[PDB]
A = this chain, B = another copy of it.
Amino acid sequence: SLIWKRKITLEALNAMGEGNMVGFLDIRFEHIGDDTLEATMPVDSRTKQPFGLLHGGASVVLAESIGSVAGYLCTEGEQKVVGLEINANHVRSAREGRVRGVCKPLHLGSRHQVWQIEIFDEKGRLCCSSRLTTAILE
Measured CB to CB, the residues of A under 8 A from B are 16-17, 19-22, 24, 45-50, 52, 55-58, 60-65, 68, 82-90
How many copies of this chain does the complex contain?
2
Give the complex CA separation of A45 and B22 in angstroms: 9
Closest residue of chain B to A57 (Cβ to Cβ) is B61
Of all chain B residues, the one with the shortest Cβ separation from A91 is B84
Chain B residues near A48 (CB-CB < 8 A) = 20-21
Is A56's CB under 8 angstroms from B86's CB? yes
Taking a contact as CB atoms closer than 8 A, the residue among B17, B55, B56, B83 that contacts A56 in the complex is B83
| Shortest CB distance A94–B (Å) | 13
Q: Shortest Cβ distance from A31 into chain B, in angstroms?
A: 20
A61 partner residues in chain B, CB cutoff 8 A: 55, 57-58, 60-61
How far does the alpha carbon of A56 sit from the alpha carbon of B65 in the complex, in Å?
9
Known: A84-B89, A87-B87, A90-B83. A45 touches B19 (CB 8 A): yes
